[PDB]
Amino acid sequence: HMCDAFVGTWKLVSSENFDDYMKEVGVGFATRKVAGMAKPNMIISVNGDVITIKSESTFKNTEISFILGQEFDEVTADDRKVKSTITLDGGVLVHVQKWDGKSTTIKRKREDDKLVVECVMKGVTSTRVYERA
Numbered sequence: 001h002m003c004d005a006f007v008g009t010w011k012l013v014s015s016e017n018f019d020d021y022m023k024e025v026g027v028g029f030a031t032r033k034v035a036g037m038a039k040p041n042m043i044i045s046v047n048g049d050v051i052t053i054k055s056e057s058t059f060k061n062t063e064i065s066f067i068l069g070q071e072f073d074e075v076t077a078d079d080r081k082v083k084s085t086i087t088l089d090g091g092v093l094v095h096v097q098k099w100d101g102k103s104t105t106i107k108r109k110r111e112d113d114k115l116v117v118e119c120v121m122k123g124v125t126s127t128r129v130y131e132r133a
């Protein structure tokens with residue numbers, strides 16, 4: 001019942017500072033422009049200990065499945081090959097990606113009827129808000 005409140009189909013409704021976050025990550029111009037336009041749907045489901053987060057947009061379809069605390073390979077939407085670990089910390093899903101000696105953390109939490117996604121790369125934060133589809 002660990003992630004019950006995250007389960008469902010979610011649609012992006014707002015984004016702040018995402019271009020600056022992507023710059024900090026190292027995303028190139030053309031990908032930042034196209035990816036910044038996208039309004040992904042995120043589909044979250046749980047089956048036993050396995051959590052799946054699928055994202056569908058006009059830019060890319062991506063999918064991760066994982067067990068909390070157990071590192072996995074992820075190819076990100078911007079084509080980074082990263083090593084990811086996702087844990088629950090006080091009800092917040094905390095997703096750390098490591099690649100090329102770099103690190104970024106993505107936190108997902110329920111706030112009212114929203115699912116709020118905070119993406120941090122060094123000093124730069126972007127906030128992306130999803131509502132139920």
Ligand SMILES: Nc1nc2ccc(F)cc2s1
Pocket residue numbers: 035036038039040055056057058059060061062077
């Ligand atoms: N499947 C996905 N499409 C996008 C589009 C933009 C983005 F920032 C993340 C994702 S994941």
